[PDB]
Ligand binder design. Structure first.
Ligand code: HEM
Ligand code: HEM
Ligand code: A1A0A
Ligand code: A1A0A
Ligand code: H4B
Ligand code: H4B
Ligand code: CL
Ligand code: CL
Ligand code: GD3
Ligand code: GD3
Ligand code: GD3
Ligand code: ZN
Lengths: 401, 401
C-alpha cells in the first residue's frame, strides 16, 4: 500500500507514503491507466478542518491553543454563514501548498518563494485590472521575474464568479483567413474571437498581445487593453544564425496562468492568476514548434539548409534544438529570467529528494515533468513517479461560457 | 468508455477495447503508477476459452462447428491432463496477437508480419541453441531484417522451464572494473558474471558479444557461443564528423528479446525469443547516451567543441542528435534495416487508426511510445493513450537465477 519507486539512473529506491493521502480520485483504474489524458452542502467543513490542520502542523503548532481556537472559528463561521474566510497567513500557506502539490509543475523547487497579493476585497472588472496590472509589473520586475499569485474573492453561493477569460494574462492573437488557417497563435483563436466580439480592434500581426476580458460577478465581461509598457517581450534572435532574427519571432516574458481554480480548505477561487518564469522548452519547443501552434519548425529547417526530404536526417530535431537555443539566448540577452530544461529537471530531482524527507513523497506527473525534447537526457526521465491529487490544489475549470 | 483526444488535429475517439481488459494494472483512482517500469484448472479454462473465442473470430468462424468442438476439446484436455496443446495456426495467431497487444511497442504497425518458428518439440538445450541460431540467421537476413519469434515448449506440470538467461540474443559484455567502473555495457554486468561463472572466458573489449546461457527443463544453464558470422554488427560513424569513427563504437543489427514470457490462452511459454529491427533512438539515445549505459554524451559533445560548462548551450541536446544521426547513417550505410523515431511514430499513428477501426481501441503506454529525444516533435506526443493489459501477451518474468 506504499508504492515502491525506483530511480533507474542510480538504482535508488523510495516509497511514496504521501500518496496514501490522495483525496480527489484521479482517472486511473486497475483496468486502464489514463495518465496520458490532459483533462481526465457542508462537506466544506471536512476540507476546512483538514486544511487548518495542515497549516498548524506546518508551523509546529498542532494541538496547541491557537489551533483549537481557529478550529472553532471556522466551525462557527460555517454554521453562521455557510462558508468561511481564510486568515491572511493561511491564504499564503494554501497558495504555496497548492503550487507544491501541482503534479505537472517542474518548477516546484521554488514553491516556498511566492508573492501572494490578497485581492479578496475586490469588486468589478475595473478593480481586477488594477490588481492584474500590479501583479504583472511586480512579477515582471524589469525581467528579473518573481513568482506571484493574486487571489480574487472566493466563490460564494447565489452570486456569480470572478473570472479571467484569457487562459493567460499575456496571449497572442489568432486570426483566421479567407482559408480558415490561422495567423498568430492557434491556441487562442477562440479568445481572440471573443475579444474581437466584445469590441477589440484586431491587428493584423502574428504577435498582437490580446486584451483581457475581465468578469466581475453577474456582470458582462469588460475588455481591458494592457499597458504596452507593462507587457515585457523578448524578440527572438539566435547567437550565430544571423537570419533567425529576420523571422520576426517574439515571446513574452511572463507566463501567468489566469484560467485555473485555486482551491484551499474547501474554498474555491476561480480567479487567482499565478505566474513564475518560463522553462525554455515551453516556448522554443511547444509554443513555436507544435504543429497546432506556431509550427515554425520547417521554416527554420529551410533557413538552416537542412534536408527536409527525409525524416532520417533528423532535420526536425536539429531545427528544434536551434530554436530552443535562440529562446535561451534571447531571454538571457534581454536579462529576462528563464531556465533551460536541463537545469529545471535537475532542480526538480532536488525537489523530489527534499519532498521525500519533508513529506514522504511528491505527486509528480511523469509525462509533464519530462521535457518535450531530449527527455531521456534529463534525470527525471529515469525517475519513476507517483501521480495523485493533494489539497490545496490548482484545479482546471470550465471556460466561463 | 475513456474519451481520447489527439491534440495536434483535434480528433476524438473512445477506447471501447479497454473495457475488455482482463488482467489488472498498477493504477488506482487514488494514484497513477503509469511510469513504473515493472508495475487452478477453472481459471486456465476461462483463459483458454477466451483465446479460442479470439482465434475463431479472426478466422470468421465464431460460433461454428469447429469452434464448439475446439472448446470441448480444450476442456477435455484440461480435465485429463491439467493443460492443453495449441494447434499450430492457433500458436501463430496467438504470437501475433501478443505482439499486437504489447502496449510499449511502437513497431506494432508490423504486427501481422511475423514469422513464427514452432520449436515446441525442442528436446534439449543443444536443440534450443540450433533453433536460436536459425532464428538469428533468418531474422538478420544479411541486414534486411525480418520479424520472427521462436516458440519453445510451454510450461507444463512435472517439468522445469526452458529459459534463455540472456535478456537478448545479442548482448555486449559488461565487465566490472579494477576501480569499480564498468567496461562495456553496464546493463549486462549480471549476465556477464553468470557467463564467466558458467565457464566463459571473458574478453575485455567494450563490445564483446556474450555467449548464450540456455536452460533445458530441470537442467543447469548450458553455455553456447554464438557463431561470430551469425551476429551482424554495424560500426558507428558519422556522415560529417569523421572523428566519430575513432570512438570505436558498434551496435548489433538484431534486437531479439529473449527473457520475456509469451502467454497464449493461459498457456505460458517462458522461452520464446522475438526480434524485429531497431528504432534508432534505442541505440543512439538510450544505449549510448544513458548515464548508466555507454554514457558517451559528454565525450561526443567535447569532441564536437560544444560548451559543456553550461546547460543552456544545449550541448547535451546537440551531441545526442548527432549520435542519433550517426546511428541512422551507419545502419543505412551497412544496409541494415533501421527506422528513425519520426517514421516509427508516424507509422504507430496509422497503427492506432487501424486498431480503432479493427478493435475499438489500442493499448498504448504513452511514456514508452514517445521517443526519448524530440518527444513533442513526433505525433504520438499529442495523442492521448489508454494503457491496459490484453491477452495474448508478452509478460515480464523473474530472472531464472
Ligand atoms: C517559477 C518558475 C516556474 C517554472 C519554471 C514552472 C514550470 C512549469 C511547467 C513547465 C509546467 C508545464 C505546464 C505546461 O506547459 O503545459 C507547469 C505547470 C504548472 N505550474 Fe509551474 N512553473 C513555475 C512556477 C509556478 C508557480 C509560481 C505556480 C503557482 C503558484 C505554478 C503552478 C503550476 C500549475 C498549477 C501547473 C499546471 C499543472 C498542474 O496543475 O499539475 N508554477 N509549470
Ligand atoms: C519490427 C520492428 C519493431 C520495432 C521498430 C519495435 C520497437 C519497439 C521499441 C522502441 C520498444 C521499446 C523498447 C524499450 O525501449 O525498452 C519495443 C518494445 C516491445 N516490443 Fe517492439 N519493435 C519491433 C518488433 C517487435 C516484435 C516482432 C515483437 C514481438 C513479436 C515486439 C514486441 C515488443 C515487446 C513485448 C516490447 C516490450 C514492451 C511491452 O511488452 O509492452 N516488437 N518495441
Ligand atoms: C507559473 C507557470 C510557469 C511556467 N513556466 N509555465 C506555466 C504554464 C504554461 C502553460 C502554457 N503551455 C504552453 C505549452 C503547451 F504545451 F501547449 C501547454 C500549455 C500552461 C500552464 F498550465 C502552465 F502552468 C505556468
Ligand atoms: C523486438 C524488438 C524490437 C526493438 N526495436 N526493440 C526491442 C526491445 C529492446 C529492448 C532494449 N532496450 C534498450 C534501450 C532501453 F532504454 F534500455 C530499454 C531497453 C528491450 C525490449 F523489451 C524490447 F522489446 C525489441
Ligand atoms: C497526450 C499528452 O498527455 C499531452 O500531449 C501532454 C503530454 N505532456 C505534456 N507535458 C507538458 N509539460 N505540457 C503539455 O501540454 C503536455 N501535453
Ligand atoms: C522511469 C521511466 O518510466 C523509465 O525511464 C521509462 C520511461 N519510458 C521509456 N520508454 C521506452 N521506450 N523505453 C524505456 O526504457 C523507457 N523507460
Ligand atoms: Cl506559454
Ligand atoms: Cl537494445
Ligand atoms: Gd542562404
Ligand atoms: Gd567534417
Ligand atoms: Gd578518448
Ligand atoms: Zn495511471
Amino acid at each position: 500500500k506504499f508504492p515502491r519507486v525506483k530511480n533507474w539512473e542510480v538504482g535508488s529506491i523510495t516509497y511514496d507514503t504521501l500518496s496514501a493521502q490522495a483525496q480527489q480520485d484521479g482517472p486511473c483504474t486497475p483496468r486502464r491507466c489514463l495518465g496520458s489524458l490532459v483533462f481526465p452542502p457542508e462537506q466544506l467543513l471536512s476540507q476546512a478542518r483538514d486544511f487548518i490542520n495542515q497549516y498548524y502542523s506546518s508551523i509546529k503548532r498542532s494541538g496547541s491553543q491557537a489551533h483549537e481556537q481557529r478550529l472553532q472559528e471556522v466551525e462557527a463561521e460555517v454554521a453562521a454563514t455557510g462558508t468561511y474566510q481564510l486568515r491572511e497567513s493561511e491564504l499564503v500557506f494554501g497558495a504555496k501548498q497548492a503550487w507544491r502539490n501541482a503534479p505537472r509543475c517542474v518548477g516546484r523547487i521554488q514553491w516556498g518563494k511566492l508573492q501572494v497579493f490578497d485581492a479578496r476585497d475586490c469588486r468589478s472588472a475595473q478593480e481586477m485590472f488594477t490588481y492584474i496590472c500590479n501583479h504583472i509589473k511586480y512579477a515582471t520586475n524589469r525581467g528579473n521575474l518573481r513568482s506571484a499569485i493574486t487571489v480574487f474573492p472566493q466563490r460564494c453561493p447565489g452570486r456569480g464568479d470572478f473570472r479571467i477569460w484569457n487562459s493567460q494574462l499575456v496571449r497572442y492573437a489568432g486570426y483566421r483567413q479567407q482559408d480558415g488557417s490561422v495567423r498568430g497563435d492557434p491556441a487562442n483563436v477562440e479568445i481572440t474571437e471573443l475579444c474581437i466580439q466584445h469590441g477589440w480592434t484586431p491587428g493584423n500581426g502574428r504577435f498582437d498581445v490580446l486584451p483581457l476580458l475581465l468578469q466581475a460577478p453577474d456582470e458582462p465581461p469588460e475588455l481591458f487593453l494592457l499597458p504596452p509598457e507593462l507587457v515585457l517581450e523578448v524578440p527572438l534572435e539566435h547567437p550565430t544564425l544571423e537570419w533567425f532574427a529576420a523571422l520576426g519571432l517574439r515571446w513574452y516574458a511572463l507566463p501567468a496562468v489566469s484560467n485555473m481554480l485555486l482551491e484551499i480548505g474547501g474554498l474555491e477561487f476561480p480567479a487567482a492568476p499565478f505566474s513564475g518564469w518560463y522553462m525554455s522548452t515551453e516556448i522554443g519547443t511547444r509554443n513555436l514548434c507544435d504543429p497546432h501552434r506556431y509550427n515554425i519548425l520547417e521554416d527554420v529547417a529551410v533557413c538552416m539548409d537542412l534536408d527536409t526530404r527525409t525524416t532520417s536526417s533528423l532535420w526536425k530535431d536539429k531545427a528544434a534544438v536551434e530554436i530552443n537555443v535562440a529562446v535561451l539566448h534571447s531571454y538571457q540577452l534581454a536579462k529576462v529570467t528563464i531556465v533551460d530544461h536541463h537545469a529545471a529537471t535537475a532542480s526538480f530531482m532536488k525537489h523530489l529528494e527534499n519532498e521525500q524527507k519533508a513529506r514522504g513523497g511528491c505527486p509528480a506527473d511523469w509525462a509533464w515533468i519530462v521535457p518535450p525534447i531530449s527527455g531521456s537526457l534529463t534525470p527525471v526521465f529515469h525517475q519513476e513517479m507517483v501521480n495523485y491529487f493533494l489539497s490545496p490544489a490548482f484545479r482546471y475549470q470550465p471556460d466561463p461560457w
